[PDB]
Design an enzyme around this catalytic site. Structure first.
Site, mmCIF file in Angstrom:
data_model
loop_
_atom_site.group_PDB
_atom_site.id
_atom_site.type_symbol
_atom_site.label_atom_id
_atom_site.label_comp_id
_atom_site.label_asym_id
_atom_site.label_seq_id
_atom_site.Cartn_x
_atom_site.Cartn_y
_atom_site.Cartn_z
ATOM 1 N N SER A 140 -11.947 -21.032 -38.013
ATOM 2 C CA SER A 140 -12.885 -20.907 -36.936
ATOM 3 C C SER A 140 -14.406 -20.471 -36.922
ATOM 4 O O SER A 140 -14.520 -20.553 -35.492
ATOM 5 C CB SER A 140 -12.336 -19.722 -35.218
ATOM 6 N N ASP A 142 -15.246 -12.435 -29.295
ATOM 7 C CA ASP A 142 -14.009 -11.576 -29.413
ATOM 8 C C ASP A 142 -13.831 -10.948 -30.358
ATOM 9 O O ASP A 142 -14.293 -10.215 -30.638
ATOM 10 C CB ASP A 142 -12.945 -12.721 -29.203
ATOM 11 N N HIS A 175 -14.630 -13.015 -34.018
ATOM 12 C CA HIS A 175 -15.253 -14.320 -34.030
ATOM 13 C C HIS A 175 -16.988 -13.761 -33.421
ATOM 14 O O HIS A 175 -16.405 -13.019 -32.950
ATOM 15 C CB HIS A 175 -14.888 -15.901 -32.848
HETATM 16 C C1 LIG Z 1 -17.232 -9.624 -40.413
HETATM 17 C C2 LIG Z 1 -17.228 -10.691 -39.720
HETATM 18 C C3 LIG Z 1 -16.152 -11.645 -39.493
HETATM 19 C C4 LIG Z 1 -16.297 -13.068 -39.079
HETATM 20 C C5 LIG Z 1 -14.678 -13.625 -38.926
HETATM 21 C C6 LIG Z 1 -14.353 -14.903 -38.345
HETATM 22 C C7 LIG Z 1 -12.534 -15.168 -38.639
HETATM 23 C C8 LIG Z 1 -13.054 -15.739 -39.898
HETATM 24 C C9 LIG Z 1 -11.896 -17.358 -39.662
HETATM 25 C C10 LIG Z 1 -10.040 -16.550 -39.430
HETATM 26 C C11 LIG Z 1 -9.027 -17.108 -38.562
HETATM 27 C C12 LIG Z 1 -8.685 -18.749 -38.794
HETATM 28 O O1 LIG Z 1 -9.754 -19.581 -38.352
HETATM 29 O O2 LIG Z 1 -8.202 -18.899 -38.358
#
Ligand SMILES: CCCCCCCCCCCC(=O)O
Length: 389
Positions: free
Chosen positions: A126, A363, A366
């Site tokens: 994502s 959110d 993200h």
């Molecule tokens: C400190 C910022 C961290 C950003 C996290 C982004 C999300 C990673 C994706 C995990 C969920 C998925 O898309 O399966």
């Protein structure tokens, strides 16, 4: 071979035409994720059509292949919509009618291409998805009123900013999952993304994998829901690179994983869960650096950006990077439930006041599109804007 040579010719010779759906942000503000669409037109008012052929694997997810360039299609959308909006953030798809879903348009390369990067192919989760899970979920996950047309943000993701800065087409294989949950985990795997990229590109005309810039980032989904252990995620990552390089890939934009435990999502997790995920992220990041060094030693063009180090700076000192808040989502979401992605949400008061461009997070998980833009800019600076590539 993925698709036989006979299957390829038969599909390529099944010539037809389709129409172009031009999507755009309805508001001038990046605080509003809502979008609408219009059919692309020509300057004389006639419907703009593109010639080419359709192909879908056993996935039955149809891609349209045309000789018309992505720049020409974008230009038709821009002129048709005639939006004096700096934040229109126009995207486009193939569609026969109003009943059609959003089909990706692949613009076939010329037989005589210079030895230069001419497209971006994204793989991941994502942090990169521009619409795959949205399309799979039938335009429901994530809700298009609070998430920008299948992107898990209020606008473009870092890969779209990288591709735009270089005036390059972007083709997305990344698939969004559900942070901290088991939803879609058998569908979001990097193995299935590499297989899909290898099958669909077999149908392309004059495809030279040496001219593709590959981006890759994943592992956070698996660490957050305990689906794959650190060695399992390291093996998956090593396999993706082996498969891609064996299939002619030469250019990669790689990144370390940001510490997702610094996101608002983990306000609702236990300290035991946080320390476990943080440790897995640190272990994976050492492996990502070793893999980047491994492919660089073999003569591949590798740009490694330390996204982990950037998000440590962004979350500890947001004010130094042009943000007012790195602790709360811009959206008024005060829990970590995948169910929230099906609904509309107002901005919390602090974000309505400052604007979404001053928040690190859109959110509970993200980044906002301003954060995605900052990551893209920082990566483009580290790679000296196509230096190794
Ligand atoms: C400190 C910022 C961290 C950003 C996290 C982004 C999300 C990673 C994706 C995990 C969920 C998925 O898309 O399966």
């Amino acid at each position: 071979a993925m698709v036989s040579a006979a299957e390829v010719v038969s599909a390529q010779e099944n010539q037809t035409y389709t129409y172009v759906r031009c999507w755009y942000r309805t508001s001038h503000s990046k605080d509003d994720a809502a979008t609408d669409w219009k059919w692309a037109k020509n300057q004389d008012g006639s419907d703009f059509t593109i010639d080419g052929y359709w192909w879908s694997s056993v996935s039955f997810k149809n891609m349209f292949y045309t000789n018309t360039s992505q720049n020409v299609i974008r230009q038709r959308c821009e002129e048709t919509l005639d939006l004096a909006n700096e934040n229109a953030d126009i995207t486009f798809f193939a569609a026969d009618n109003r009943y059609s879903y959003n089909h990706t348009i692949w613009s076939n390369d010329a037989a005589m291409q210079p030895d230069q990067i001419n497209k971006v192919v994204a793989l991941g989760d994502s942090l990169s998805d521009t619409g795959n899970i949205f399309n799979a979920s039938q335009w429901r996950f994530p809700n298009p009123n609070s998430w920008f047309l299948g992107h898990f943000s209020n606008g473009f993701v870092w890969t779209e900013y990288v591709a735009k800065a270089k005036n390059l087409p972007l083709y997305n294989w990344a698939v969004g999952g559900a942070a901290g949950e088991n939803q879609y985990i058998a569908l979001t795997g990097v193995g299935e993304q590499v297989s899909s990229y290898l099958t669909y590109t077999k149908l392309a005309k004059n495809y030279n994998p040496a001219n593709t810039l590959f981006t890759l980032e994943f592992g956070l989904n698996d660490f957050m829901n305990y689906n794959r252990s650190v060695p399992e995620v390291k093996a998956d990552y090593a396999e993706a690179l082996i498969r891609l390089t064996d299939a002619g890939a030469k250019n990669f934009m790689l990144m370390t994983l940001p510490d997702a435990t610094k996101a608002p999502q983990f306000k609702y997790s236990t300290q035991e869960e946080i320390e476990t995920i943080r440790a897995k992220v640190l272990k994976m990041n050492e492996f990502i650096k070793a893999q980047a060094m491994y492919y660089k030693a073999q003569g591949y063009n590798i740009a490694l950006f330390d996204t982990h180090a950037l998000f440590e700076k962004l979350t500890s000192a947001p004010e130094e990077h042009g943000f007012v808040n790195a602790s709360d989502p811009c959206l008024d979401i005060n829990r970590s439930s995948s169910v929230d992605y099906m609904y509309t949400h107002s901005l919390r008061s602090e974000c309505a006041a400052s604007g979404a461009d001053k928040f690190v997070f859109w959110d509970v998980t993200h980044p906002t599109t301003a954060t995605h833009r900052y990551v893209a800019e920082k990566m483009l600076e580290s790679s000296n804007n196509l230096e190794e590539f």
